[PDB]
């Protein structure tokens, strides 16, 4: 019945992705089925010409990066394609082949952009969401893939100059990398990697003291707390920890957040030892 007619329409939309004359409408309809159709990612991945058609939408926006000329209509169409790629990135049947094809690298030109226009800010936000869905799988394969790319410097620049939503996702991505044992060891491997992160995190604390954000501060504190697990990083944090994290600067913005207050108390306790 209706379950059948919906599945037949999805197969029709997937085939319509291969034609430029019908791809825009197919992108719109399929992105609506991202949450309700658990088998969507294998159906997209089944023919690689479908994935090539999705990537063609991605590649078509590269000329809009310099100078930043991306419009809201152009950004919305590609974000729909990114939403379908996010489906493939998070499904356990397609996640490994998705990483083996290095598909996330097609999004890195978007993450490298610095334009503060809304079409680019939301393009980075949706692009960060694809990476965010990858680290939510809690797979070792995801962390190893991200460490062989330049995702850390891309996230750090967004964490200091992006919008609040983009800073939150970018900080969450860094948080998930740090929570992995190899990711923490990677950032503490050299002086430059750790100092770059500590400088960015400290700058965000300064920005948060002027414009408070409970959701962003939660992930910043979690990054600091995880860094304190490394002995060399713990000694460095005893000297460079922002005073706003030791004072009652954020007591009002955390008046209802019991989780961040517990992490902040654990962080200062890890540094006193």
């Amino acid at each position: 019945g209706p379950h059948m007619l919906e599945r037949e329409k999805i197969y029709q939309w997937i085939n319509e992705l291969s034609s430029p004359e019908t791809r825009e409408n197919a992108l719109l309809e399929l992105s609506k089925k991202r949450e309700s159709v658990p088998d969507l990612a294998p159906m997209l991945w089944h023919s690689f010409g479908t994935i090539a058609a999705l990537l063609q939408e991605i590649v078509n926006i590269y000329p809009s990066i310099n100078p930043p000329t991306l419009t809201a209509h152009q950004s919305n169409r590609v974000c729909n394609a990114l939403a379908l790629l996010q489906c493939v990135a998070s499904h356990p049947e397609t996640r490994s082949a998705f990483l083996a094809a290095h598909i996330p690298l097609f999004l890195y030109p978007f993450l490298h952009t610095v334009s503060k226009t809304r079409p680019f800010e939301y393009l980075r936000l949706t692009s960060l969401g694809v990476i965010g869905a990858l680290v939510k799988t809690d797979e070792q394969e995801v962390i190893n893939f991200l460490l062989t790319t330049e995702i850390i410097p891309l996230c750090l620049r967004i964490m200091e100059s992006g919008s609040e939503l983009s800073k939150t996702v970018a900080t969450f991505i860094l948080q998930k990398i740090l929570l992995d044992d190899t990711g923490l060891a990677y950032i503490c491997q050299t002086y430059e990697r750790f100092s770059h992160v500590a400088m960015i995190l400290g700058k965000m604390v300064l920005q948060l003291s002027k414009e408070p954000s409970a959701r962003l501060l939660k992930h910043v504190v979690r990054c600091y707390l995880r860094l304190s697990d490394n002995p060399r990083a713990r000694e460095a944090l005893r000297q460079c920890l922002p005073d706003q994290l030791k004072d009652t600067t954020f007591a009002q913005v955390l008046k209802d957040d019991t989780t961040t207050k517990r992490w902040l108390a654990q962080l200062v306790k890890n540094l006193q030892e």
Partner: peptide, 25 residues
């Protein structure tokens, strides 16, 4: 392990207003 929001849903919300305020008569 969550952000408190959906980045793609918030993108659709933000770009819907700008798409209507960028087009020409």
């Amino acid at each position: 392990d969550d952000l408190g929001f959906d980045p793609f849903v918030e993108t659709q919300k933000g770009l819907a207003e700008l798409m209507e305020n960028e087009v020409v008569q």
